[PDB]
Amino acid sequence: SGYEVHHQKLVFFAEDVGSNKGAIIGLMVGGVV
Amino acid sequence: SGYEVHHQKLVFFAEDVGSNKGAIIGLMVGGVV
Amino acid sequence: SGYEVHHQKLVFFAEDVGSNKGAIIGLMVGGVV
Amino acid sequence: SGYEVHHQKLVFFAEDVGSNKGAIIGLMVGGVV
Amino acid sequence: SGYEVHHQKLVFFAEDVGSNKGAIIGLMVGGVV
Amino acid sequence: DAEFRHDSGYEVHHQKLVFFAEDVGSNKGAIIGLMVGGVV
Amino acid sequence: DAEFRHDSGYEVHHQKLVFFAEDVGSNKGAIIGLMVGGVV
Amino acid sequence: DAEFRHDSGYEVHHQKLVFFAEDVGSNKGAIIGLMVGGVV
Amino acid sequence: DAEFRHDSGYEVHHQKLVFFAEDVGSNKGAIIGLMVGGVV
Amino acid sequence: DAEFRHDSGYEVHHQKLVFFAEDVGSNKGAIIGLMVGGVV
Amino acid sequence: DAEFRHDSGYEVHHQKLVFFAEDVGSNKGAIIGLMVGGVV
Amino acid sequence: DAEFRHDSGYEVHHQKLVFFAEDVGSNKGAIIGLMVGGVV
Amino acid sequence: DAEFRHDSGYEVHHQKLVFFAEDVGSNKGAIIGLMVGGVV
Amino acid sequence: DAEFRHDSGYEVHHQKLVFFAEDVGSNKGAIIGLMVGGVV
Amino acid sequence: DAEFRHDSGYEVHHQKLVFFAEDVGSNKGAIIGLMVGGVV
Amino acid sequence: SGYEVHHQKLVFFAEDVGSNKGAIIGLMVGGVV
Amino acid sequence: SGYEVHHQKLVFFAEDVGSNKGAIIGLMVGGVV
Amino acid sequence: SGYEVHHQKLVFFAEDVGSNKGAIIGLMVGGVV
Amino acid sequence: SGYEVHHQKLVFFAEDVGSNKGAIIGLMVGGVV
Amino acid sequence: SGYEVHHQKLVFFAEDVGSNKGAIIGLMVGGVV
């Protein structure tokens, strides 16, 4: 049905990625990968 | 049905990406990849 | 049905991307990739 | 049905990733990978 | 049915990952990998 | 006086291929009958 | 006086291919009968 | 006077392949009949 | 005067392959009939 | 004057393969009929 | 529909030859540095 | 549909030859540094 | 549909030869440094 | 559909040969440094 | 569908040969440093 | 020095000759080939 | 020094000759081949 | 020194010769092959 | 020194010869092969 | 020194010869092979 999301604070740095066959996520809320 | 999202603060830096066969995400809310 | 999204603040920097066969996203809300 | 998520604070740094055949996540809430 | 998650604070650093055939997660709440 | 070779090339030939595909969703990567070297 | 070679090229030939595709969604990458080297 | 070789190339040939696919969801990587070397 | 070789290449040939796939969910990696070397 | 070889390559051939797959969930890794060397 | 080949021909190349002859009597046949196929 | 080959030909190459001959009497046949196939 | 081959041909190459001959009487046949196949 | 081969051919290569001959009388047959197959 | 082979051919290579001959009388047959198969 | 030859009677027939690297002779008297 | 030859009678027939690396002779008197 | 040869009668027939690396002779008198 | 040869009568037939590395002779008188 | 040879009568037939590395002779008188 749905999402209620708030007041999230994120900082990030990503170094080299070869092959992302999937999920590289800071915060993942109910997603499908 | 739906999303209610707010007051999110994000800063990010991404280094080299080779092949992104997927999701590289700061915050992912209910998405499909 | 729908989205209600607000007061989001984002800053980002992306370095070289080879092949983006997917999603490179700061914030993704309910999208399909 | 759904998610109620809030006041989350995240900082992260990722070093080189070879092949992400899966999930590399700071916080994962109810997602499917 | 759903998730109620809040006031989480996370900091992390990831070194090189070869092949992530699975889950490398700081906090995982009810996800499926 | 010496011989130096890099023969890192390739050859493909006598092949018979039938490739049939039904509905495809996001094709994030590849569906390949036969792949000979290369990078997706 | 010496010979130097880089033969990193390619050859493809006697082939018979039938490729049939049904509905395709976003094709983010490739659907290839036969791929010989190269980069998608 | 010496011979030096790097023959890290490849050859593929007498093959008969039938590849049939039904509905595919996100193809994050690859579905390959035959893969000969290479990188997905 | 000496011979030096790196023959780290490859050959594939007399093959008969039938590959049939039913519904596929996220293909995070690969479904391969035959894989000969390479990296997914 | 000496001979030096690295033959860490490969050969695959007379094969007959039938590969059939039913519904696949997240394929985190691989389903392979035959894998000859390589890395998933 | 079929391929038919007779490749009974020839190739000769990177060669360095020094040929010196002193008095020759009846040369009934041949004095050859290098002979590649053929008939005397 | 079938492949038919007769490759009864030949190749000769990286060679260094020094051939020196002193007085020769009737040469009934041959004096050859190197003979590769053929008929005298 | 079948493959048929007669590869009864030949290859010769990295060679270094020094051939020196002193007085030769009737050469009824042959004096050969190296003979590779063939008929005298 | 079947493979048929006659590979009754030959290969010769990395060789270093020094051949020196003193007076030769009737050479009824052959004096050969190295003979690889063939008929005198 | 079956494989049939006659590989009755030959290979010769890394060799170092010094052949020196003094006076030869009728050479009815052969003087050979190295003989690999064949018929005199 | 010399030859004294007489009253010789010869009849001959020769079939195909491939390569005559030598002597094919009915009567040879003191010759050099 | 020499030859004294006489009253010789010869008839001959030769079939195919491949390679005559030598002497094929009816009568050979003191010759060199 | 020499030869004194006489009243010789010869008839011959030769079939196929492959390689004559030598002497095929009806009568050979003091020759060198 | 020499030869004195006479009143010789010869008839012969030769079948196929492969390689004559030597002497095939009806009558050989003092020859060298 | 020499030969005195006479009144010799010879008839012969030779079948296939493979490799004559030697002497095949009807009558051999003082020869060298």
Side-chain angles (χ1 to χ4, degrees), chain T residues 9-30:
Chain T
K9 180 174 174 174
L10 169 64
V11 179
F12 75 96
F13 186 104
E15 287 288 337
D16 293 355
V17 177
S19 178
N20 189 25
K21 293 182 179 80
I24 302 172
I25 302 173
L27 167 62
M28 179 178 183
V29 180

mmCIF file with all atom_site columns, all heavy atoms in Angstrom, chain T residues 9-30:
data_model
loop_
_atom_site.group_PDB
_atom_site.id
_atom_site.type_symbol
_atom_site.label_atom_id
_atom_site.label_alt_id
_atom_site.label_comp_id
_atom_site.label_asym_id
_atom_site.label_entity_id
_atom_site.label_seq_id
_atom_site.pdbx_PDB_ins_code
_atom_site.Cartn_x
_atom_site.Cartn_y
_atom_site.Cartn_z
_atom_site.occupancy
_atom_site.B_iso_or_equiv
_atom_site.pdbx_formal_charge
_atom_site.auth_seq_id
_atom_site.auth_comp_id
_atom_site.auth_asym_id
_atom_site.auth_atom_id
_atom_site.pdbx_PDB_model_num
ATOM 1   N N   . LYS T 1 9  ? 75.381 -68.158 -70.998 1.00 0.00 ? 9  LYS T N   1
ATOM 2   C CA  . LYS T 1 9  ? 74.007 -68.023 -71.466 1.00 0.00 ? 9  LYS T CA  1
ATOM 3   C C   . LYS T 1 9  ? 73.032 -67.813 -70.300 1.00 0.00 ? 9  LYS T C   1
ATOM 4   O O   . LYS T 1 9  ? 72.882 -68.683 -69.444 1.00 0.00 ? 9  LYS T O   1
ATOM 5   C CB  . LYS T 1 9  ? 73.654 -69.250 -72.298 1.00 0.00 ? 9  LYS T CB  1
ATOM 6   C CG  . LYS T 1 9  ? 72.259 -69.286 -72.875 1.00 0.00 ? 9  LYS T CG  1
ATOM 7   C CD  . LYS T 1 9  ? 72.117 -70.497 -73.803 1.00 0.00 ? 9  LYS T CD  1
ATOM 8   C CE  . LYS T 1 9  ? 70.698 -70.680 -74.304 1.00 0.00 ? 9  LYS T CE  1
ATOM 9   N NZ  . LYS T 1 9  ? 70.604 -71.785 -75.331 1.00 0.00 ? 9  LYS T NZ  1
ATOM 10  N N   . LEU T 1 10 ? 72.359 -66.663 -70.273 1.00 0.00 ? 10 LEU T N   1
ATOM 11  C CA  . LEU T 1 10 ? 71.460 -66.308 -69.175 1.00 0.00 ? 10 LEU T CA  1
ATOM 12  C C   . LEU T 1 10 ? 70.093 -65.843 -69.538 1.00 0.00 ? 10 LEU T C   1
ATOM 13  O O   . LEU T 1 10 ? 69.925 -64.998 -70.408 1.00 0.00 ? 10 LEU T O   1
ATOM 14  C CB  . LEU T 1 10 ? 72.090 -65.230 -68.301 1.00 0.00 ? 10 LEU T CB  1
ATOM 15  C CG  . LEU T 1 10 ? 71.181 -64.505 -67.221 1.00 0.00 ? 10 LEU T CG  1
ATOM 16  C CD1 . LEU T 1 10 ? 70.699 -65.405 -66.182 1.00 0.00 ? 10 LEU T CD1 1
ATOM 17  C CD2 . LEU T 1 10 ? 72.015 -63.480 -66.521 1.00 0.00 ? 10 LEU T CD2 1
ATOM 18  N N   . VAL T 1 11 ? 69.115 -66.415 -68.881 1.00 0.00 ? 11 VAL T N   1
ATOM 19  C CA  . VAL T 1 11 ? 67.754 -65.959 -69.032 1.00 0.00 ? 11 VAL T CA  1
ATOM 20  C C   . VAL T 1 11 ? 67.135 -65.627 -67.683 1.00 0.00 ? 11 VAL T C   1
ATOM 21  O O   . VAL T 1 11 ? 67.153 -66.471 -66.790 1.00 0.00 ? 11 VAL T O   1
ATOM 22  C CB  . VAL T 1 11 ? 66.900 -67.034 -69.707 1.00 0.00 ? 11 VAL T CB  1
ATOM 23  C CG1 . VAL T 1 11 ? 65.468 -66.540 -69.842 1.00 0.00 ? 11 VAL T CG1 1
ATOM 24  C CG2 . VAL T 1 11 ? 67.498 -67.381 -71.059 1.00 0.00 ? 11 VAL T CG2 1
ATOM 25  N N   . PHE T 1 12 ? 66.573 -64.444 -67.500 1.00 0.00 ? 12 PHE T N   1
ATOM 26  C CA  . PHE T 1 12 ? 65.936 -64.306 -66.202 1.00 0.00 ? 12 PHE T CA  1
ATOM 27  C C   . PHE T 1 12 ? 64.779 -63.363 -66.174 1.00 0.00 ? 12 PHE T C   1
ATOM 28  O O   . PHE T 1 12 ? 64.623 -62.499 -67.034 1.00 0.00 ? 12 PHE T O   1
ATOM 29  C CB  . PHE T 1 12 ? 66.869 -63.873 -65.120 1.00 0.00 ? 12 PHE T CB  1
ATOM 30  C CG  . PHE T 1 12 ? 67.243 -62.531 -65.124 1.00 0.00 ? 12 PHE T CG  1
ATOM 31  C CD1 . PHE T 1 12 ? 66.554 -61.652 -64.317 1.00 0.00 ? 12 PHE T CD1 1
ATOM 32  C CD2 . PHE T 1 12 ? 68.245 -62.096 -65.871 1.00 0.00 ? 12 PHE T CD2 1
ATOM 33  C CE1 . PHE T 1 12 ? 66.887 -60.363 -64.270 1.00 0.00 ? 12 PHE T CE1 1
ATOM 34  C CE2 . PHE T 1 12 ? 68.583 -60.796 -65.836 1.00 0.00 ? 12 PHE T CE2 1
ATOM 35  C CZ  . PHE T 1 12 ? 67.914 -59.922 -65.033 1.00 0.00 ? 12 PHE T CZ  1
ATOM 36  N N   . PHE T 1 13 ? 63.975 -63.539 -65.149 1.00 0.00 ? 13 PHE T N   1
ATOM 37  C CA  . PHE T 1 13 ? 62.815 -62.716 -64.920 1.00 0.00 ? 13 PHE T CA  1
ATOM 38  C C   . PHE T 1 13 ? 62.789 -62.200 -63.493 1.00 0.00 ? 13 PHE T C   1
ATOM 39  O O   . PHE T 1 13 ? 62.906 -62.982 -62.547 1.00 0.00 ? 13 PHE T O   1
ATOM 40  C CB  . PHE T 1 13 ? 61.590 -63.572 -65.159 1.00 0.00 ? 13 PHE T CB  1
ATOM 41  C CG  . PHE T 1 13 ? 60.317 -62.880 -65.118 1.00 0.00 ? 13 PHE T CG  1
ATOM 42  C CD1 . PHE T 1 13 ? 59.670 -62.600 -66.284 1.00 0.00 ? 13 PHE T CD1 1
ATOM 43  C CD2 . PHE T 1 13 ? 59.743 -62.482 -63.939 1.00 0.00 ? 13 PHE T CD2 1
ATOM 44  C CE1 . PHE T 1 13 ? 58.473 -61.954 -66.275 1.00 0.00 ? 13 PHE T CE1 1
ATOM 45  C CE2 . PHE T 1 13 ? 58.563 -61.834 -63.939 1.00 0.00 ? 13 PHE T CE2 1
ATOM 46  C CZ  . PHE T 1 13 ? 57.922 -61.570 -65.097 1.00 0.00 ? 13 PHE T CZ  1
ATOM 47  N N   . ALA T 1 14 ? 62.633 -60.903 -63.320 1.00 0.00 ? 14 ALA T N   1
ATOM 48  C CA  . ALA T 1 14 ? 62.550 -60.368 -61.967 1.00 0.00 ? 14 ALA T CA  1
ATOM 49  C C   . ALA T 1 14 ? 61.186 -59.784 -61.658 1.00 0.00 ? 14 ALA T C   1
ATOM 50  O O   . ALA T 1 14 ? 60.713 -58.924 -62.374 1.00 0.00 ? 14 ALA T O   1
ATOM 51  C CB  . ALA T 1 14 ? 63.604 -59.304 -61.775 1.00 0.00 ? 14 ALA T CB  1
ATOM 52  N N   . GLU T 1 15 ? 60.593 -60.194 -60.553 1.00 0.00 ? 15 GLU T N   1
ATOM 53  C CA  . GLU T 1 15 ? 59.317 -59.687 -60.044 1.00 0.00 ? 15 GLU T CA  1
ATOM 54  C C   . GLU T 1 15 ? 59.609 -58.442 -59.255 1.00 0.00 ? 15 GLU T C   1
ATOM 55  O O   . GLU T 1 15 ? 60.756 -58.006 -59.187 1.00 0.00 ? 15 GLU T O   1
ATOM 56  C CB  . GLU T 1 15 ? 58.532 -60.665 -59.199 1.00 0.00 ? 15 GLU T CB  1
ATOM 57  C CG  . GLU T 1 15 ? 57.861 -61.841 -59.949 1.00 0.00 ? 15 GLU T CG  1
ATOM 58  C CD  . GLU T 1 15 ? 56.654 -61.435 -60.780 1.00 0.00 ? 15 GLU T CD  1
ATOM 59  O OE1 . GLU T 1 15 ? 56.077 -60.427 -60.498 1.00 0.00 ? 15 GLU T OE1 1
ATOM 60  O OE2 . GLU T 1 15 ? 56.284 -62.163 -61.666 1.00 0.00 ? 15 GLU T OE2 1
ATOM 61  N N   . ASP T 1 16 ? 58.587 -57.849 -58.686 1.00 0.00 ? 16 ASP T N   1
ATOM 62  C CA  . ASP T 1 16 ? 58.749 -56.586 -58.039 1.00 0.00 ? 16 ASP T CA  1
ATOM 63  C C   . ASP T 1 16 ? 59.836 -56.499 -56.994 1.00 0.00 ? 16 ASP T C   1
ATOM 64  O O   . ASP T 1 16 ? 59.968 -57.328 -56.104 1.00 0.00 ? 16 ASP T O   1
ATOM 65  C CB  . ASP T 1 16 ? 57.461 -56.196 -57.348 1.00 0.00 ? 16 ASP T CB  1
ATOM 66  C CG  . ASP T 1 16 ? 56.364 -55.923 -58.300 1.00 0.00 ? 16 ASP T CG  1
ATOM 67  O OD1 . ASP T 1 16 ? 56.616 -55.933 -59.477 1.00 0.00 ? 16 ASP T OD1 1
ATOM 68  O OD2 . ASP T 1 16 ? 55.266 -55.688 -57.866 1.00 0.00 ? 16 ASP T OD2 1
ATOM 69  N N   . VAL T 1 17 ? 60.587 -55.435 -57.071 1.00 0.00 ? 17 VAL T N   1
ATOM 70  C CA  . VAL T 1 17 ? 61.630 -55.201 -56.100 1.00 0.00 ? 17 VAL T CA  1
ATOM 71  C C   . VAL T 1 17 ? 61.287 -53.963 -55.335 1.00 0.00 ? 17 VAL T C   1
ATOM 72  O O   . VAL T 1 17 ? 60.979 -52.937 -55.921 1.00 0.00 ? 17 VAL T O   1
ATOM 73  C CB  . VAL T 1 17 ? 63.000 -55.059 -56.766 1.00 0.00 ? 17 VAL T CB  1
ATOM 74  C CG1 . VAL T 1 17 ? 64.082 -54.747 -55.716 1.00 0.00 ? 17 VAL T CG1 1
ATOM 75  C CG2 . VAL T 1 17 ? 63.335 -56.343 -57.491 1.00 0.00 ? 17 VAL T CG2 1
ATOM 76  N N   . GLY T 1 18 ? 61.316 -54.057 -54.034 1.00 0.00 ? 18 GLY T N   1
ATOM 77  C CA  . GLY T 1 18 ? 61.005 -52.947 -53.175 1.00 0.00 ? 18 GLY T CA  1
ATOM 78  C C   . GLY T 1 18 ? 62.189 -52.020 -53.125 1.00 0.00 ? 18 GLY T C   1
ATOM 79  O O   . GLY T 1 18 ? 62.219 -51.019 -53.837 1.00 0.00 ? 18 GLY T O   1
ATOM 80  N N   . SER T 1 19 ? 63.178 -52.362 -52.323 1.00 0.00 ? 19 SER T N   1
ATOM 81  C CA  . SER T 1 19 ? 64.373 -51.558 -52.224 1.00 0.00 ? 19 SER T CA  1
ATOM 82  C C   . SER T 1 19 ? 65.618 -52.397 -52.344 1.00 0.00 ? 19 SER T C   1
ATOM 83  O O   . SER T 1 19 ? 65.976 -53.200 -51.476 1.00 0.00 ? 19 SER T O   1
ATOM 84  C CB  . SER T 1 19 ? 64.378 -50.817 -50.930 1.00 0.00 ? 19 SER T CB  1
ATOM 85  O OG  . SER T 1 19 ? 65.552 -50.074 -50.795 1.00 0.00 ? 19 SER T OG  1
ATOM 86  N N   . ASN T 1 20 ? 66.329 -52.190 -53.410 1.00 0.00 ? 20 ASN T N   1
ATOM 87  C CA  . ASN T 1 20 ? 67.473 -53.025 -53.639 1.00 0.00 ? 20 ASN T CA  1
ATOM 88  C C   . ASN T 1 20 ? 68.722 -52.538 -52.993 1.00 0.00 ? 20 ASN T C   1
ATOM 89  O O   . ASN T 1 20 ? 69.656 -52.194 -53.693 1.00 0.00 ? 20 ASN T O   1
ATOM 90  C CB  . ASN T 1 20 ? 67.774 -53.138 -55.085 1.00 0.00 ? 20 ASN T CB  1
ATOM 91  C CG  . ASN T 1 20 ? 68.792 -54.149 -55.320 1.00 0.00 ? 20 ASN T CG  1
ATOM 92  O OD1 . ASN T 1 20 ? 68.937 -55.054 -54.495 1.00 0.00 ? 20 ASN T OD1 1
ATOM 93  N ND2 . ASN T 1 20 ? 69.505 -54.002 -56.376 1.00 0.00 ? 20 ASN T ND2 1
ATOM 94  N N   . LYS T 1 21 ? 68.821 -52.572 -51.685 1.00 0.00 ? 21 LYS T N   1
ATOM 95  C CA  . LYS T 1 21 ? 70.046 -52.042 -51.090 1.00 0.00 ? 21 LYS T CA  1
ATOM 96  C C   . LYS T 1 21 ? 71.151 -53.069 -51.094 1.00 0.00 ? 21 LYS T C   1
ATOM 97  O O   . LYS T 1 21 ? 71.689 -53.425 -50.052 1.00 0.00 ? 21 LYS T O   1
ATOM 98  C CB  . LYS T 1 21 ? 69.807 -51.586 -49.668 1.00 0.00 ? 21 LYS T CB  1
ATOM 99  C CG  . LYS T 1 21 ? 68.913 -50.424 -49.559 1.00 0.00 ? 21 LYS T CG  1
ATOM 100 C CD  . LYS T 1 21 ? 68.763 -49.994 -48.129 1.00 0.00 ? 21 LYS T CD  1
ATOM 101 C CE  . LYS T 1 21 ? 67.874 -48.789 -48.035 1.00 0.00 ? 21 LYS T CE  1
ATOM 102 N NZ  . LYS T 1 21 ? 66.415 -49.145 -48.097 1.00 0.00 ? 21 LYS T NZ  1
ATOM 103 N N   . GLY T 1 22 ? 71.555 -53.475 -52.271 1.00 0.00 ? 22 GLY T N   1
ATOM 104 C CA  . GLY T 1 22 ? 72.492 -54.564 -52.405 1.00 0.00 ? 22 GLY T CA  1
ATOM 105 C C   . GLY T 1 22 ? 72.525 -55.095 -53.818 1.00 0.00 ? 22 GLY T C   1
ATOM 106 O O   . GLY T 1 22 ? 72.391 -54.342 -54.785 1.00 0.00 ? 22 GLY T O   1
ATOM 107 N N   . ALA T 1 23 ? 72.860 -56.364 -53.950 1.00 0.00 ? 23 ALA T N   1
ATOM 108 C CA  . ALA T 1 23 ? 73.012 -56.980 -55.247 1.00 0.00 ? 23 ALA T CA  1
ATOM 109 C C   . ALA T 1 23 ? 71.989 -58.057 -55.529 1.00 0.00 ? 23 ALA T C   1
ATOM 110 O O   . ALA T 1 23 ? 71.882 -59.013 -54.768 1.00 0.00 ? 23 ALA T O   1
ATOM 111 C CB  . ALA T 1 23 ? 74.389 -57.613 -55.339 1.00 0.00 ? 23 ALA T CB  1
ATOM 112 N N   . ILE T 1 24 ? 71.267 -57.916 -56.622 1.00 0.00 ? 24 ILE T N   1
ATOM 113 C CA  . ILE T 1 24 ? 70.378 -58.943 -57.108 1.00 0.00 ? 24 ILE T CA  1
ATOM 114 C C   . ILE T 1 24 ? 70.978 -59.260 -58.444 1.00 0.00 ? 24 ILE T C   1
ATOM 115 O O   . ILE T 1 24 ? 70.849 -58.463 -59.372 1.00 0.00 ? 24 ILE T O   1
ATOM 116 C CB  . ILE T 1 24 ? 68.934 -58.484 -57.290 1.00 0.00 ? 24 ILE T CB  1
ATOM 117 C CG1 . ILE T 1 24 ? 68.400 -57.975 -55.973 1.00 0.00 ? 24 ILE T CG1 1
ATOM 118 C CG2 . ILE T 1 24 ? 68.119 -59.667 -57.807 1.00 0.00 ? 24 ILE T CG2 1
ATOM 119 C CD1 . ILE T 1 24 ? 67.033 -57.289 -55.994 1.00 0.00 ? 24 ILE T CD1 1
ATOM 120 N N   . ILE T 1 25 ? 71.670 -60.372 -58.550 1.00 0.00 ? 25 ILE T N   1
ATOM 121 C CA  . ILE T 1 25 ? 72.392 -60.632 -59.787 1.00 0.00 ? 25 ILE T CA  1
ATOM 122 C C   . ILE T 1 25 ? 72.226 -62.056 -60.290 1.00 0.00 ? 25 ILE T C   1
ATOM 123 O O   . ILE T 1 25 ? 72.095 -62.985 -59.499 1.00 0.00 ? 25 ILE T O   1
ATOM 124 C CB  . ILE T 1 25 ? 73.894 -60.255 -59.653 1.00 0.00 ? 25 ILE T CB  1
ATOM 125 C CG1 . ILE T 1 25 ? 74.021 -58.781 -59.263 1.00 0.00 ? 25 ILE T CG1 1
ATOM 126 C CG2 . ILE T 1 25 ? 74.620 -60.480 -60.967 1.00 0.00 ? 25 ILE T CG2 1
ATOM 127 C CD1 . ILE T 1 25 ? 75.401 -58.335 -58.941 1.00 0.00 ? 25 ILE T CD1 1
ATOM 128 N N   . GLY T 1 26 ? 72.147 -62.235 -61.596 1.00 0.00 ? 26 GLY T N   1
ATOM 129 C CA  . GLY T 1 26 ? 72.128 -63.580 -62.110 1.00 0.00 ? 26 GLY T CA  1
ATOM 130 C C   . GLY T 1 26 ? 73.493 -64.184 -61.843 1.00 0.00 ? 26 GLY T C   1
ATOM 131 O O   . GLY T 1 26 ? 73.641 -65.032 -60.955 1.00 0.00 ? 26 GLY T O   1
ATOM 132 N N   . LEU T 1 27 ? 74.482 -63.733 -62.600 1.00 0.00 ? 27 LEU T N   1
ATOM 133 C CA  . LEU T 1 27 ? 75.860 -64.136 -62.406 1.00 0.00 ? 27 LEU T CA  1
ATOM 134 C C   . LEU T 1 27 ? 76.715 -62.946 -62.109 1.00 0.00 ? 27 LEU T C   1
ATOM 135 O O   . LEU T 1 27 ? 76.644 -61.938 -62.804 1.00 0.00 ? 27 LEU T O   1
ATOM 136 C CB  . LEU T 1 27 ? 76.413 -64.885 -63.611 1.00 0.00 ? 27 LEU T CB  1
ATOM 137 C CG  . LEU T 1 27 ? 77.982 -65.086 -63.635 1.00 0.00 ? 27 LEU T CG  1
ATOM 138 C CD1 . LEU T 1 27 ? 78.445 -65.872 -62.525 1.00 0.00 ? 27 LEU T CD1 1
ATOM 139 C CD2 . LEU T 1 27 ? 78.387 -65.842 -64.875 1.00 0.00 ? 27 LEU T CD2 1
ATOM 140 N N   . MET T 1 28 ? 77.451 -63.016 -61.028 1.00 0.00 ? 28 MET T N   1
ATOM 141 C CA  . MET T 1 28 ? 78.328 -61.938 -60.657 1.00 0.00 ? 28 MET T CA  1
ATOM 142 C C   . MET T 1 28 ? 79.751 -62.428 -60.671 1.00 0.00 ? 28 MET T C   1
ATOM 143 O O   . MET T 1 28 ? 80.085 -63.317 -59.900 1.00 0.00 ? 28 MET T O   1
ATOM 144 C CB  . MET T 1 28 ? 77.963 -61.460 -59.268 1.00 0.00 ? 28 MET T CB  1
ATOM 145 C CG  . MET T 1 28 ? 78.804 -60.368 -58.759 1.00 0.00 ? 28 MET T CG  1
ATOM 146 S SD  . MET T 1 28 ? 78.272 -59.830 -57.162 1.00 0.00 ? 28 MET T SD  1
ATOM 147 C CE  . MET T 1 28 ? 79.390 -58.521 -56.906 1.00 0.00 ? 28 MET T CE  1
ATOM 148 N N   . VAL T 1 29 ? 80.605 -61.855 -61.490 1.00 0.00 ? 29 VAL T N   1
ATOM 149 C CA  . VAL T 1 29 ? 81.968 -62.310 -61.521 1.00 0.00 ? 29 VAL T CA  1
ATOM 150 C C   . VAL T 1 29 ? 82.909 -61.241 -61.081 1.00 0.00 ? 29 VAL T C   1
ATOM 151 O O   . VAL T 1 29 ? 83.151 -60.274 -61.794 1.00 0.00 ? 29 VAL T O   1
ATOM 152 C CB  . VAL T 1 29 ? 82.377 -62.724 -62.930 1.00 0.00 ? 29 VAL T CB  1
ATOM 153 C CG1 . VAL T 1 29 ? 83.826 -63.202 -62.930 1.00 0.00 ? 29 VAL T CG1 1
ATOM 154 C CG2 . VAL T 1 29 ? 81.467 -63.786 -63.418 1.00 0.00 ? 29 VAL T CG2 1
ATOM 155 N N   . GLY T 1 30 ? 83.388 -61.373 -59.875 1.00 0.00 ? 30 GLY T N   1
ATOM 156 C CA  . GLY T 1 30 ? 84.374 -60.464 -59.321 1.00 0.00 ? 30 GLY T CA  1
ATOM 157 C C   . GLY T 1 30 ? 83.976 -59.015 -59.182 1.00 0.00 ? 30 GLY T C   1
ATOM 158 O O   . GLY T 1 30 ? 84.846 -58.143 -59.294 1.00 0.00 ? 30 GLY T O   1
#
